[PDB]
Design a protein around this nucleic acid. Structure first.
Ligand code: MG
Ligand code: MG
Ligand code: MG
Ligand code: MG
Ligand code: MG
Ligand code: MG
Ligand code: MG
Ligand code: MG
Ligand code: MG
Ligand code: MG
Ligand code: MG
Ligand code: MG
Ligand code: MG
Ligand code: MG
Ligand code: MG
Ligand code: MG
Ligand code: MG
Ligand code: MG
Ligand code: MG
Ligand code: MG
Ligand code: MG
Ligand code: MG
Ligand code: MG
Ligand code: MG
Ligand code: MG
Ligand code: MG
Ligand code: MG
Ligand code: MG
Ligand code: MG
Ligand code: MG
Ligand code: MG
Ligand code: MG
Ligand code: MG
Ligand code: MG
Ligand code: MG
Ligand code: MG
Ligand code: MG
Ligand code: MG
Ligand code: MG
Ligand code: MG
Ligand code: MG
Ligand code: MG
Ligand code: MG
Ligand code: MG
Ligand code: MG
Ligand code: MG
Ligand code: MG
Lengths: 260, 155
RNA sequence: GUAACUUCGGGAUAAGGAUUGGCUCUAAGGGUCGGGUACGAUCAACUUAGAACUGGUACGGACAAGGGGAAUCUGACUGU
RNA sequence: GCCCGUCGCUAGUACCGAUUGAAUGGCUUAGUGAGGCCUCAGGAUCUGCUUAGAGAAGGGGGCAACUCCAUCUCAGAGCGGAGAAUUUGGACAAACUUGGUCAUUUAGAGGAACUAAAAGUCGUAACAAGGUUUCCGUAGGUGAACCUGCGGAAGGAUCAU
RNA sequence: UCGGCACCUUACGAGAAAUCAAAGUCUUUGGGUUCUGGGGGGAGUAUGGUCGCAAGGCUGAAACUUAAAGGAAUUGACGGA
RNA sequence: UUGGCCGGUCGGAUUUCCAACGGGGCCUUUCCUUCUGGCUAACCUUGAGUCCUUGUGGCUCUUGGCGAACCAGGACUUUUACUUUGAAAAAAUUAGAGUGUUCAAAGCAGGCGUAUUGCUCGAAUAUAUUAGCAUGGAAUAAUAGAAUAGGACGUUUGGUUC
RNA sequence: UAUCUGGUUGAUCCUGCCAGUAGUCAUAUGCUUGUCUCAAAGAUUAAGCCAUGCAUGUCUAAGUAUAAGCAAUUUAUACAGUGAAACUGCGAAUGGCUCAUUAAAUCAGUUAUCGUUUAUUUGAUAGUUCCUUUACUACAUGGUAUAACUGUGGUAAUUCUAGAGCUAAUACAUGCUUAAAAUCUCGACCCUUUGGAAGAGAUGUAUUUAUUAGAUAAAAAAUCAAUGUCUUCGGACUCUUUGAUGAUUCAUAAUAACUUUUCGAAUCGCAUGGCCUUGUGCUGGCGAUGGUUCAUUCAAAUUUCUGCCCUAUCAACUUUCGAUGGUAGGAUAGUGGCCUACCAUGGUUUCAACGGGUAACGGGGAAUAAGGGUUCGAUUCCGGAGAGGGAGCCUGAGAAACGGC
């Protein structure tokens, strides 16, 4: 009421941040930024609740005000900065680079990448428009505006962003056969490229996706992120390759990998 | 609908920013803007070669169809360019595991491209708020026969 | 706008409340008028409604013109 | 044996009831109508300029081509901005007065019931063919239970000529 | 033979029983549908509405009170049978 | 898809020896709204050769190959109800997996070395119903259509706007 | 954990209630009470009233320091460190509390904005700044006017302020320098006509209007202002830029103008390199804070569909002063009877409208239940409303704000 909310209750935080129920009434409310409130990960949740590098919020502030962290190349000394999908966090001490990708349980896993892979990120094209003076641009999934794109770049494609200059190196179309990473819904964190795409004029285009163990699943088109062609993705993939084993297979693996 | 008395208001009735040049006498003599409303709905030829203005038409007017598509039965045609449709539905009470007949009366803008009598089933599309109560606009009239030609007087 | 009561006819103008001039306009409401073996001259009247403007907020401007209500006794009433 | 009512003491519960009863909360007609807002004006001031009159001050190349941006008395016809009080007409409208209507609570002389309720008084209406078979509808009469007329029922005291 | 008013026997069945060819085809619970009832009183009362000339009808509570009221059958006792 | 026997792993891979459940096509008079322009079909029709030792479980420059194994316009559509499956669905709570909070209510932690240049597992899953959206089915229950035929079907008139 | 038992009778079988019995994250109260973990708590009655104190302020290397403050500067005689006060910016619209109003209202799930605003974050983005160019003014950088402060006061009293004297800015108000091109409009100068030209100005981005483009099934031909550029003067002239959406008068571009002309850096810190006209000349790094527009995010506003307790001792309601719709306007951030003007006579209702009641905020949920259900949800999360009651408004991006008026 009366204006924008500045607080976030714990138990109103997104469940994938895995915040403990007690130890506070408040969750860190993500700032405005490239990603949404519920589709992202604040830097305090990444640096204290994932990497365990900081014990407090004051230690997260002390880490951030030393300009060690940087998200997507730029430094980002904001504690609740909304680092979301495809964002690259570079910690200069211990030379660590992370790409924020979903593990297949649907949560932001810690995925360590190399300095070559930290040079770029991927962006799903959200719209293609003409700006003023007739200049075309594309708008990606992280709020980037890139002027003068390739004229083959349409919506729901994926450009590769060079992150030293925000330029499109190459791009991947949306057509049958090419990998899909799933960035929402209940198939969140999955991989598996295609069966086809059904159109549904009026609303909510649907995509059929069939992973390497031949399990089909339908997702909305807005939850669908192209990561490459079938085999050789343009990014590295996390621990699990986005398969979503069932709970019996999970227990049959976990009993195996604890008795050596 | 090139006839039937378009200019019947205090103001001059025209489509906005559709200019007729009195100098250049190219053989059409009355321009007419139209669009296709989308979603697989035919633009009627009465809308094409009409002369009515109707700024709330889905084809020749300034409104767009987006959102809910509903169907209904026309129960009133007594307002000017507006009808009331009846949406009958069965509501489920879990306790008795049974249904009850409910109904909603939806006021719908009807274009003069459509000739609607009562007892007709129309398809209506959602638009922006047209009036206090109207939010839907007739996109398709789906009345075919009515079973009435064998009620006329014979020898 | 209009209560109790009622013989359902009344009570009732119940009770109460607004408006009203002048000037300048506007809109309605007629009669005569005619056709091919997509058409209006012309004539006349006072009713109603609305609007602007105007004024020492005056205006049924003199005249003319119900005080009302709640009850009781009594005779039904009109009448002599 | 059981049992019904009138009448009689005691207590409680609601009901009606003169009181234009009262209290409260809405909605509300009309009247008056604060306040701010928009608007019509208004101009205490508080200033930057310029002056065709004595402003005892260059017309920004130059004291002749009617052609070069040129400032202190002070009264001003030339201005320009800022602007308070006050103020005009609107819309919004608190609040008050008046009347209406609805919702809820509460006082009331007195009246008529019901219950506690078994005890008292008068009878014996019902249960037996309850001593006039009972009961229903209706009408009238009566201290009271009741009685009588008319039609009905059997839940009758007759499944039967 | 169809349709009707009923009757008689039996209890397959039903019921608390009396009884019932419907009061059966119900815990092995669903053919369709309307109306009514939720312990006894207070009470078919009060109030409001509505119909009627009226008598009245139709709709219709509550406070309060109560531990039973009732139904069917059995045995007994009693009867101006 | 229960398995089933080389029991040769001293009662522990298998497979047409198969029955019975559950799908997808084709033909039996059997619509799949219809053309276009991109596929060039388990290649309907097999120039050319079959060094494999017999069989009915394994192949090529092809003879213009039912250009019909899904992408976007229509001479384009009877409507539903029902039911299947799925998306999109706040957490907490509920059910429930894991885990000696010393037990338990809880919590979401923890566990394992060589504890000296630290390894590692989690924080699942289900339900979340009505209404809306998508999807398969076509019994059941409605509705529609050719009777005064203003009915249907015609790749090779193109006329009052086009 | 799908269970019954006592009570009508002399006894029986029932109908049927009363009573028992078990829970309550359900209250109160009585009696008793050693330990460990966990911790609800002035909801109900009075959204009744409040003494007192506190709950919203905030400064970095980086807006403004002549404190007549402190510490004692590091070519440091402009400043240099620290810094009260005050100006400026930002916040105070969040949180916390309560449940009074509220019955298609809130709310829930599901739509929509092709019907809108959006400080901030993030990304992109600005060579055009000259009136009527042949009437340019510092850009090596414009102007006054104020707090704090000094001093003189008023009042019993307030987070009251008056007069006078100073001085700043990222406050306020002004105001330039940042090519080259092309394309249009006007134009002193074409003889027997498909016969040409310097110059002068305008052209960024906002605003507002009008108009234009924003296309699109495969090929073809002769005519009538018209050699529409048909080069040996009829050797047919080999010709297509244009994005998105299911859908747009969309994005965007163009033309003519319009404007109490918007913006287009007169700001700050740290570092002080490079070059040759050694002038303290021309250049030059990392940031900070601003700024226009478009995106993005955080929102907001309105919105579609279906779903809410009891009551008919509520059956008709709404429609003068808007009810339902049309046209146009106004207002709005924008749609819209939202309001206005002029019209028309609609809109809803036994499938329960409208009215009344609620000891009703709604939902996620809770208690209990074999299953189906019944009851509760003021209360940890989400949404709404409110700050004694009404109403009105200022500021701001955002409030009809109440620790603002
Ligand atoms: Mg709040
Ligand atoms: Mg925040
Ligand atoms: Mg309207
Ligand atoms: Mg009167
Ligand atoms: Mg009277
Ligand atoms: Mg009046
Ligand atoms: Mg007059
Ligand atoms: Mg007398
Ligand atoms: Mg008399
Ligand atoms: Mg007595
Ligand atoms: Mg103002
Ligand atoms: Mg007797
Ligand atoms: Mg007697
Ligand atoms: Mg007797
Ligand atoms: Mg006797
Ligand atoms: Mg007798
Ligand atoms: Mg008697
Ligand atoms: Mg008699
Ligand atoms: Mg008889
Ligand atoms: Mg009886
Ligand atoms: Mg049986
Ligand atoms: Mg009962
Ligand atoms: Mg009873
Ligand atoms: Mg009565
Ligand atoms: Mg008996
Ligand atoms: Mg344990
Ligand atoms: Mg008894
Ligand atoms: Mg101890
Ligand atoms: Mg309280
Ligand atoms: Mg509370
Ligand atoms: Mg506080
Ligand atoms: Mg700063
Ligand atoms: Mg800020
Ligand atoms: Mg207009
Ligand atoms: Mg309008
Ligand atoms: Mg209108
Ligand atoms: Mg309606
Ligand atoms: Mg309440
Ligand atoms: Mg609730
Ligand atoms: Mg609640
Ligand atoms: Mg309460
Ligand atoms: Mg508020
Ligand atoms: Mg209070
Ligand atoms: Mg602010
Ligand atoms: Mg307020
Ligand atoms: Mg307070
Ligand atoms: Mg507050």
């Amino acid at each position: 009421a009366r204006g924008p909310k500045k607080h976030l209750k714990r138990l109103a935080a997104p469940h994938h941040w895995l915040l403990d129920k007690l130890s506070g009434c408040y969750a860190p409310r993500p700032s405005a930024g490239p990603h949404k409130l519920r589709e992202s990960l604040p830097l305090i949740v990444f640096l204290r609740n994932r990497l365990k590098y900081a014990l407090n919020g004051r230690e997260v502030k002390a880490i951030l005000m030393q300009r060690h962290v940087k998200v997507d190349g730029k430094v980002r000394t904001d504690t609740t900065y909304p680092a979301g999908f495809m964002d690259v966090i570079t910690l200069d001490a211990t030379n660590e680079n992370f790409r924020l990708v979903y593990d297949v349980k649907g949560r932001f896993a810690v995925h360590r990448i190399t300095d070559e892979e930290a040079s770029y990120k991927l962006g799903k094209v959200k719209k293609v428009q003409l700006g003023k003076k007739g200049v075309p641009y594309v708008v990606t999934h992280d709020g980037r505006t890139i002027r003068y794109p390739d004229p083959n770049i349409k919506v729901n494609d994926t450009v590769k962003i060079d992150l030293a200059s925000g330029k499109i190196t190459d791009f991947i179309k949306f057509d049958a056969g090419k990998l899909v990473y799933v960035t929402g819904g209940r198939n969140l964190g999955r991989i598996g490229t295609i069966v086809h795409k059904e159109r549904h004029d009026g609303g909510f285009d649907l995509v059929h996706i069939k992973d390497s163990l031949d399990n089909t699943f339908v997702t909305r088109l807005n939850n669908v992120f192209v990561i490459g062609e079938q085999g050789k993705p343009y990014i590295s993939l996390p621990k699990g390759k986005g398969i979503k084993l069932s709970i019996a297979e999970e227990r049959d693996r976990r009993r195996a990998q604890q008795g050596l | 609908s090139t006839e039937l008395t378009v200019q019947s208001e205090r103001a001059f009735q025209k489509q906005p920013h559709i200019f007729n040049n009195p100098k250049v006498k190219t053989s059409k003599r009355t321009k007419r803007w139209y669009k296709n409303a989308g979603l697989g709905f035919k633009t009627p030829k009465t809308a094409i070669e009409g002369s009515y203005i109707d700024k709330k038409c889905p084809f020749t007017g300034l409104v767009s169809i987006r959102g809910k598509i509903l169907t209904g039965t026309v129960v009133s045609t007594k307002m000017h360019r507006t009808i009331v449709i009846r949406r009958a539905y069965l509501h489920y009470i879990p306790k008795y595991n049974r249904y009850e007949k409910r109904h909603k009366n939806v006021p719908v803008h009807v274009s003069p491209a459509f000739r609607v009598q009562v007892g007709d089933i129309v398809t209506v599309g959602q638009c922006r708020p047209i009036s206090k109560t109207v939010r839907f606009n007739v996109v398709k009239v789906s009345a075919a026969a009515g079973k009435a030609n064998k009620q006329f007087a014979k020898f």
